[PDB]
Write an enzyme that holds these catalytic residues in place. Structure first.
Site, PDB file in Angstrom:
ATOM      1  N   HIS A 197      26.698  21.789  -7.187  1.00 52.23           N
ATOM      2  CA  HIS A 197      27.975  22.507  -7.195  1.00 52.23           C
ATOM      3  C   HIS A 197      29.123  21.638  -7.698  1.00 52.23           C
ATOM      4  O   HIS A 197      29.202  20.446  -7.369  1.00 52.23           O
ATOM      5  CB  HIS A 197      28.308  22.981  -5.781  1.00 52.23           C
ATOM      6  CG  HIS A 197      28.465  21.868  -4.792  1.00 52.23           C
ATOM      7  ND1 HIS A 197      29.694  21.365  -4.428  1.00 52.23           N
ATOM      8  CD2 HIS A 197      27.545  21.153  -4.101  1.00 52.23           C
ATOM      9  CE1 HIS A 197      29.527  20.394  -3.548  1.00 52.23           C
ATOM     10  NE2 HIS A 197      28.233  20.248  -3.331  1.00 52.23           N
ATOM     11  N   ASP A 198      30.000  22.249  -8.494  1.00 46.50           N
ATOM     12  CA  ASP A 198      31.280  21.653  -8.900  1.00 46.50           C
ATOM     13  C   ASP A 198      31.144  20.455  -9.832  1.00 46.50           C
ATOM     14  O   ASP A 198      32.112  19.724 -10.063  1.00 46.50           O
ATOM     15  CB  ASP A 198      32.120  21.302  -7.668  1.00 46.50           C
ATOM     16  CG  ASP A 198      32.312  22.488  -6.752  1.00 46.50           C
ATOM     17  OD1 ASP A 198      32.640  23.573  -7.268  1.00 46.50           O
ATOM     18  OD2 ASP A 198      32.123  22.334  -5.529  1.00 46.50           O
TER      19      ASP A 198
ATOM     20  N   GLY B 299      27.316  16.727  -5.390  1.00 48.26           N
ATOM     21  CA  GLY B 299      28.463  17.593  -5.678  1.00 48.26           C
ATOM     22  C   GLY B 299      29.632  16.899  -6.356  1.00 48.26           C
ATOM     23  O   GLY B 299      29.886  15.716  -6.119  1.00 48.26           O
TER      24      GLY B 299
HETATM   25  C1  LIG Z   1      22.962   5.595  -3.992  1.00 44.85           C
HETATM   26  C2  LIG Z   1      23.259   6.986  -4.547  1.00 44.85           C
HETATM   27  C3  LIG Z   1      22.393   8.045  -3.859  1.00 44.85           C
HETATM   28  C4  LIG Z   1      22.907   9.447  -4.217  1.00 44.85           C
HETATM   29  C5  LIG Z   1      22.005  10.558  -3.672  1.00 44.85           C
HETATM   30  C6  LIG Z   1      22.587  11.933  -4.021  1.00 44.85           C
HETATM   31  C7  LIG Z   1      21.617  13.084  -3.708  1.00 44.85           C
HETATM   32  C8  LIG Z   1      22.267  14.442  -4.030  1.00 44.85           C
HETATM   33  C9  LIG Z   1      21.315  15.631  -3.812  1.00 44.85           C
HETATM   34  C10 LIG Z   1      21.953  16.949  -4.287  1.00 44.85           C
HETATM   35  C11 LIG Z   1      22.771  17.583  -3.156  1.00 44.85           C
HETATM   36  C12 LIG Z   1      23.793  18.607  -3.666  1.00 44.85           C
HETATM   37  O1  LIG Z   1      23.126  19.700  -4.298  1.00 44.85           O
HETATM   38  C13 LIG Z   1      24.582  19.140  -2.467  1.00 44.85           C
HETATM   39  C14 LIG Z   1      25.900  18.363  -2.272  1.00 44.85           C
HETATM   40  O2  LIG Z   1      25.820  16.949  -2.433  1.00 44.85           O
HETATM   41  O3  LIG Z   1      26.443  18.739  -0.976  1.00 44.85           O
HETATM   42  C15 LIG Z   1      27.396  17.824  -0.406  1.00 44.85           C
HETATM   43  C16 LIG Z   1      28.820  17.936  -0.993  1.00 44.85           C
HETATM   44  O4  LIG Z   1      28.833  17.541  -2.369  1.00 44.85           O
HETATM   45  C17 LIG Z   1      29.806  17.058  -0.199  1.00 44.85           C
HETATM   46  C18 LIG Z   1      31.241  17.127  -0.734  1.00 44.85           C
HETATM   47  O5  LIG Z   1      31.698  18.488  -0.731  1.00 44.85           O
HETATM   48  O6  LIG Z   1      29.798  17.513   1.176  1.00 44.85           O
HETATM   49  C19 LIG Z   1      28.503  17.383   1.830  1.00 44.85           C
HETATM   50  O7  LIG Z   1      27.992  16.039   1.889  1.00 44.85           O
HETATM   51  P1  LIG Z   1      28.510  15.065   3.060  1.00 44.85           P
HETATM   52  O8  LIG Z   1      28.010  15.518   4.382  1.00 44.85           O
HETATM   53  O9  LIG Z   1      27.941  13.609   2.659  1.00 44.85           O
HETATM   54  O10 LIG Z   1      30.102  15.131   2.921  1.00 44.85           O
HETATM   55  P2  LIG Z   1      31.037  13.866   2.567  1.00 44.85           P
HETATM   56  O11 LIG Z   1      30.602  13.118   1.361  1.00 44.85           O
HETATM   57  O12 LIG Z   1      32.492  14.528   2.337  1.00 44.85           O
HETATM   58  O13 LIG Z   1      31.109  13.001   3.917  1.00 44.85           O
HETATM   59  C20 LIG Z   1      31.589  11.663   3.889  1.00 44.85           C
HETATM   60  C21 LIG Z   1      30.980  10.835   5.022  1.00 44.85           C
HETATM   61  O14 LIG Z   1      30.153  11.603   5.928  1.00 44.85           O
HETATM   62  C22 LIG Z   1      29.433  10.560   6.612  1.00 44.85           C
HETATM   63  N1  LIG Z   1      28.360  11.012   7.557  1.00 44.85           N
HETATM   64  C23 LIG Z   1      27.916  12.351   7.569  1.00 44.85           C
HETATM   65  C24 LIG Z   1      26.922  12.763   8.460  1.00 44.85           C
HETATM   66  C25 LIG Z   1      26.354  11.849   9.350  1.00 44.85           C
HETATM   67  O15 LIG Z   1      25.471  12.199  10.131  1.00 44.85           O
HETATM   68  N2  LIG Z   1      26.786  10.512   9.349  1.00 44.85           N
HETATM   69  C26 LIG Z   1      27.788  10.089   8.461  1.00 44.85           C
HETATM   70  O16 LIG Z   1      28.151   8.914   8.480  1.00 44.85           O
HETATM   71  C27 LIG Z   1      28.870   9.749   5.435  1.00 44.85           C
HETATM   72  O17 LIG Z   1      28.676   8.391   5.852  1.00 44.85           O
HETATM   73  C28 LIG Z   1      30.005   9.825   4.405  1.00 44.85           C
HETATM   74  O18 LIG Z   1      30.660   8.555   4.291  1.00 44.85           O
HETATM   75  C29 LIG Z   1      27.472  18.224   1.074  1.00 44.85           C
HETATM   76  N3  LIG Z   1      26.160  18.097   1.729  1.00 44.85           N
HETATM   77  C30 LIG Z   1      25.805  18.951   2.690  1.00 44.85           C
HETATM   78  C31 LIG Z   1      24.416  18.725   3.290  1.00 44.85           C
HETATM   79  O19 LIG Z   1      26.528  19.865   3.088  1.00 44.85           O
END
Ligand SMILES: CCCCCCCCCCC[C@@H](O)CC(=O)O[C@H]1[C@H](O)[C@@H](CO)O[C@H](OP(=O)(O)OP(=O)(O)OC[C@H]2O[C@@H](n3ccc(=O)[nH]c3=O)[C@H](O)[C@@H]2O)[C@@H]1NC(C)=O
Ligand SMILES: CCCCCCCCCCC[C@@H](O)CC(=O)O[C@H]1[C@H](O)[C@@H](CO)O[C@H](OP(=O)(O)OP(=O)(O)OC[C@H]2O[C@@H](n3ccc(=O)[nH]c3=O)[C@H](O)[C@@H]2O)[C@@H]1NC(C)=O
Ligand SMILES: CCCCCCCCCCC[C@@H](O)CC(=O)O[C@H]1[C@H](O)[C@@H](CO)O[C@H](OP(=O)(O)OP(=O)(O)OC[C@H]2O[C@@H](n3ccc(=O)[nH]c3=O)[C@H](O)[C@@H]2O)[C@@H]1NC(C)=O
Lengths: 262, 262, 262
Positions: free
Chosen positions: B125-126, B143
């Site tokens: 997305h996005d 994302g």
């Molecule tokens: C070394 C590089 C490896 C990269 C691997 C990438 C794999 C990508 C796979 C494709 C996924 C994609 O299709 C979906 C998309 O990425 O969704 C997310 C969406 O882009 C994002 C922003 O809008 O929000 C969500 O992701 P996050 O839960 O990570 O949100 P965030 O990035 O705003 O949160 C920031 C902080 O949450 C922290 N966190 C979250 C949960 C937890 O249990 N503990 C924690 O520390 C984490 O450490 C991070 O620093 C979204 N996820 C969910 C499950 O809802």
């Protein structure tokens, strides 16, 4: 021609010209092109696409969402009638892709017999996979890669184009292989480096302890002696005169073009 | 409306409302939703799902098991009528996924023209993918990721959410990109770090040696000078007044939010 | 039996014997085997294969090209009538694979409720996934892996066979997990190592600051005290008598067989 004893699901689309052998089974929603040959007893479970100039052997099991014989991903490819050959008794799992060759690369992608290609394994154009190999989930071969007999490519591991993965090699999961891996070697890392001889694999495959010792000695000549490969080649050749298993190294060196992982 | 010259396979399911252009080809077992537009000459090989509010351009080739316009994987998404835009002459390979945007992220996932998206590439997305890009097998964008013109994402490589991959960048296989990558940069590793300028890419794309030199000089200002980015920004801007190619850095800095890979 | 209120697409193939619950929806080109149970309100979008002895709960969403209940990839498997159990309200995305168990491994692959399994996630034979978990794109579990409640497995990450991923764990993307991960721990790398407590996850899930402090103290006993695990086990048990959340460690230790990531 479709053999009278072959099953073709009413929803499957087998194009006129396709050859389907005795007791083969083409499942629901499969598509089989006019230049495809499918051998006796081979099964396409469902949702399989087989096209191009593609020959598949006997007793294969090909699972749903696999694409076999498809146009390769090399930008150099221009639609030339290149080929895929697949042998017998392979297990080709969900979403596996095996692509046709390129004229530039010899025109043929080849897979042998008794291989296990796990979910989303990728065999690029001009690759040669031998017999009894295992590619774990998402194992990815770039173009022109050789994977020799009994070699194992771990989950999530990718192999750089033109690389040779030697016979009886074990590459660990989550690895990136950028150079050639001599036969019998354990490889791991990103980029992958050598971690000794695949002793356990050789044991299970019936290698004598004398052969394993000789292979370990060859390994030491390559990686522990401090000598160049050119220096040790004749020593390895000499050793092969007593222990025929060591000849695998000599044969590998003659094919190797990218240098050895070190 | 379906154009009179478009082919729609009898087994394909095209919902009333879908727009299908001249000489388009919808293969066996495809599903096309009522809010989908498919441009002139675009081909869906077989077993393709296209849904959502999705516009696809001309002369695209979309391979089997691809899902285009699908509900994204962001838990924040609630079914809002968000969008996908795909340009012209893209090659979208087996099992590629391109997901619709989120309202929170601007509502649009965009892909330009002349891109090669290899097997199981994922455009979340996005995301915004430009023109002439290559995503190799299993290349995965989280994302809100930007992949700028000519950028290459290597096999098995993933990109952290919100990251910008600059124009003409080459990211090596088996990498994990956690921060922004300036244009023209070679990146590799886990997490990915910079390894100089993509000189070979620039050569092949017709960049003058004066432009490549200027870009290399800009790279050195960022990574070798020991100065902060704020200090070198005006220097890079000054350089751009003679060599217009350097402006790519300036434009990138204004979009960058996650800091630079170092 | 198929419930009178269930929708079954005319192109879907549901074998006699399959149980399909009220208001379930079987989309185009799905295949459902005779030993499959699909619960009330569960949706198979299109092109889904469900087979084997497989029980799926209520309100699940299963996307195209997923394979659920399929023959596992363990060479030891011989076609025994092993099982899959999937709970309620899961989101099982495109190309996800969930394989049946092996007799050797207990005969059951189990997935709980409210999980998000992203594109091409793989749940091997004899795995146990709990509730509220997230497996990101290409997250790959080898055989006999446990993923406990709320655990997150990052994109491109693979988990070695027999490993336990503890409750509330966060494993970073592009990681390779070779040993057991205690509950509440952040893990990253290849091979993965520990990087403190998942404080943010615990906060969002309603953990008190006293509980988080206690958990952090338990973490320190394991990784910072310099003592062996056998030495700190009773200390952790004592702490659990005041802060019940710490009991998760004690319960985990009793299941752990591969040693701790360090
Ligand atoms: C070394 C590089 C490896 C990269 C691997 C990438 C794999 C990508 C796979 C494709 C996924 C994609 O299709 C979906 C998309 O990425 O969704 C997310 C969406 O882009 C994002 C922003 O809008 O929000 C969500 O992701 P996050 O839960 O990570 O949100 P965030 O990035 O705003 O949160 C920031 C902080 O949450 C922290 N966190 C979250 C949960 C937890 O249990 N503990 C924690 O520390 C984490 O450490 C991070 O620093 C979204 N996820 C969910 C499950 O809802
Ligand atoms: C750590 C290990 C990671 C491994 C990851 C492997 C992932 C493989 C995924 C499967 C892809 C496969 O199905 C397709 C196949 O690999 O195609 C290519 C074909 O095998 C090759 C030879 O015939 O030619 C093409 O690849 P390259 O463009 O890399 O050709 P090359 O190997 O002959 O080029 C050598 C040099 O080009 C350099 N280069 C290219 C572009 C650029 O922008 N910058 C640059 O430096 C690069 O550094 C490299 O040293 C082909 N590609 C394209 C897009 O046309
Ligand atoms: C850094 C983390 C990377 C993780 C990557 C994980 C990728 C997983 C992909 C999904 C596969 C899954 O769907 C199938 C499942 O994992 O099957 C196996 C089954 O879970 C297991 C136990 O029941 O048995 C089999 O795996 P192994 O052959 O590894 O068995 P093992 O774990 O009991 O063997 C232990 C030792 O065998 C050694 N060995 C084996 C062969 C060889 O040639 N050389 C060698 O050293 C190896 O070093 C290891 O220490 C099974 N395999 C086969 C091909 O039959």
């Amino acid at each position: 021609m479709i053999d009278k004893s072959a099953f073709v699901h009413p929803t499957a689309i087998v194009e006129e010209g396709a050859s389907i052998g005795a007791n083969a089974h083409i499942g629901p929603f499969c598509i089989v092109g006019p230049h495809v040959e499918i051998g006796e007893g081979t099964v396409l479970k469902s949702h399989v696409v087989v096209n191009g100039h593609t020959k598949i052997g006997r007793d294969n099991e090909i699972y749903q969402f696999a694409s076999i014989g498809e146009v390769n991903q090399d930008l150099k490819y221009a639609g030339e009638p290149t080929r895929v050959e697949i042998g017998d008794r392979n297990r080709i799992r969900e979403s596996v892709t095996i692509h046709r060759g390129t004229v530039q690369g010899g025109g043929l992608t080849k897979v042998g017999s008794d291989n296990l290609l796990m979910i989303n394994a990728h065999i690029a154009h001009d690759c040669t996979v031998g017999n009894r190999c295992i590619l774990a989930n998402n194992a990815t071969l770039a173009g022109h890669v050789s994977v020799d007999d009994f070699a194992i490519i771990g989950g999530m591991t990718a192999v750089h184009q033109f690389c040779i993965i030697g016979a009886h090699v074990m590459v660990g999961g989550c690895s990136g292989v950028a150079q050639d891996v001599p036969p019998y070697v354990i490889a791991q890392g990103n980029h992958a480096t050598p971690f000794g001889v695949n002793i356990e694999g050789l044991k299970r495959r019936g290698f004598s302890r004398e052969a394993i010792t000789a292979i370990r000695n060859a390994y030491k000549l390559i990686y522990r002696s401090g000598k160049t490969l050119d220096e040790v080649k004749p020593e390895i050749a000499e050793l092969a005169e007593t222990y025929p298993e060591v000849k695998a190294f000599t044969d590998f060196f003659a094919r190797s073009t990218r240098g050895l992982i070190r």
